[PDB]
Amino acid sequence: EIDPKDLTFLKELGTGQFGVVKYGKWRGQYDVAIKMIKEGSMSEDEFIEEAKVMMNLSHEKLVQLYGVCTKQRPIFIITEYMANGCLLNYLREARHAFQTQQLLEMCKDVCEAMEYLESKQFLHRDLAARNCLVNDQGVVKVSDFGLSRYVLDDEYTSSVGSKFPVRWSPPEVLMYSKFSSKSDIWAFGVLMWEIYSLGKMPYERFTNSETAEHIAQGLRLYRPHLASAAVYTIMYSCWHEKADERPTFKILLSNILDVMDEE
Ligand SMILES: Cc1c(NC(=O)c2ccc(N3CCCCC3)cc2)cccc1-c1cn(C)c(=O)c(Nc2ccc(C(=O)N3CCN(C)CC3)cc2)n1
């Protein structure tokens, strides 16, 4: 529990699923981002109880939760500050003119965070470039892991909703609501595709409906130009029709390191 007296709001960073997000200072020294939770957007009591578990989740490649302000409405979620914002927008800026080695490093950053979460049996459920952030040193970190469970918007949580992550979901999620470590694995493969295609929308010429049909037929995303045979094999391995044939994040990390050494 952070005392709100220790927080200074400085600028607005934008709006997400839970409302306004601000940049500020913690104890007059530390850069922070602060979610101001819009009343009605979150299952607040449930979040508050889980907050402890999530505060114990500490990894260099996870956006660090610093604390909460819950003795007030609206409640605050105080986190690490990531100066360069959203990985998706970051990818779409042509000026960065990324080398492929830099692209693979983004993949490795995320894979490292996901391996940690996997070892803690903790699912993200909404892994995508939009939900990764970039700090001042170009380091990519995974944001809002596990927070999907507290969203009240039916357009987001329902498979047929307009905001559901259809293009990042394996067939068994869309057809059966079968969520597992292997559904996070699938989404990671799609994230790799996002990175290597420099922020293109997956299945960019299809609707959400057509995408579901496509992956049910055993068909998959094409190799991004910038991805080698080896890089494509890795992301593709994440998209095996049988969930238990998909790799673990530990195996993926090993494969990424291999490619780094080889290419
Ligand atoms: C994270 C974030 C959001 N989005 C959400 O809050 C949200 C997203 C999904 C969601 N769902 C439900 C739960 C499961 C996942 C899906 C719920 C909430 C909105 C606005 C800012 C930040 C933000 C945060 N943090 C922790 C930051 O550090 C940060 N930093 C920024 C830094 C710079 C910019 C910026 O303005 N630019 C423009 C100039 N460029 C040079 C740099 C980037 C923006 C954000 N922004």
From Swiss-Prot:
Catalytic residues of the enzyme: D126
GO biological process: adaptive immune response; apoptotic signaling pathway; B cell activation; B cell affinity maturation; B cell receptor signaling pathway; calcium-mediated signaling; cell maturation; cellular response to interleukin-7
Modified residues (Phosphoserine): S209, S228
Disease entry from the Swiss-Prot or TrEMBL record: X-linked agammaglobulinemia: Humoral immunodeficiency disease which results in developmental defects in the maturation pathway of B-cells. Affected boys have normal levels of pre-B-cells in their bone marrow but virtually no circulating mature B-lymphocytes. This results in a lack of immunoglobulins of all classes and leads to recurrent bacterial infections like otitis, conjunctivitis, dermatitis, sinusitis in the first few years of life, or even some patients present overwhelming sepsis or meningitis, resulting in death in a few hours.
Cellular compartments per GO CC: cytoplasm; cytoplasmic vesicle; cytosol; membrane raft; nucleus; perinuclear region of cytoplasm; plasma membrane
Occurrences of domain Protein kinase (ranges): 7-260
Name the record gives this protein: Tyrosine-protein kinase BTK
Result when mutating Y222E: Defective in mediating calcium response
Keyword tRNA-binding annotated: no
UniProt note: domains: The PH domain mediates the binding to inositol polyphosphate and phosphoinositides, leading to its targeting to the plasma membrane. It is extended in the BTK kinase family by a region designated the TH (Tec homology) domain, which consists of about 80 residues preceding the SH3 domain.
Annotated residues for binding of clofedanol: T79, E80, Y81, M82, L147
Native source species: Homo sapiens (Human)
Subunit structure as annotated in this protein's UniProt entry: Part of a complex composed of EEIG1, TNFRSF11A/RANK, PLCG2, GAB2, TEC and BTK; complex formation increases in the presence of TNFSF11/RANKL. Binds GTF2I through the PH domain. Interacts with SH3BP5 via the SH3 domain. Interacts with IBTK via its PH domain. Interacts with ARID3A, CAV1, FASLG, PIN1, TLR8 and TLR9. Interacts with MPL/TPOR.
One annotated GO molecular function: protein tyrosine kinase activity
Effect of R130Q: In XLA; severe; disturbs ATP-binding
Residues bound to dasatinib: T79, E80, Y81, M82
Chief place where the protein resides: cytoplasm
Result after altering L147P: In XLA; growth hormone deficiency
Sequence motif: CAV1-binding, positions: 186-193
Primary gene name: BTK
Post-translational modifications reported in the UniProt record: Following B-cell receptor (BCR) engagement, translocates to the plasma membrane where it gets phosphorylated at Tyr-156 by LYN and SYK.
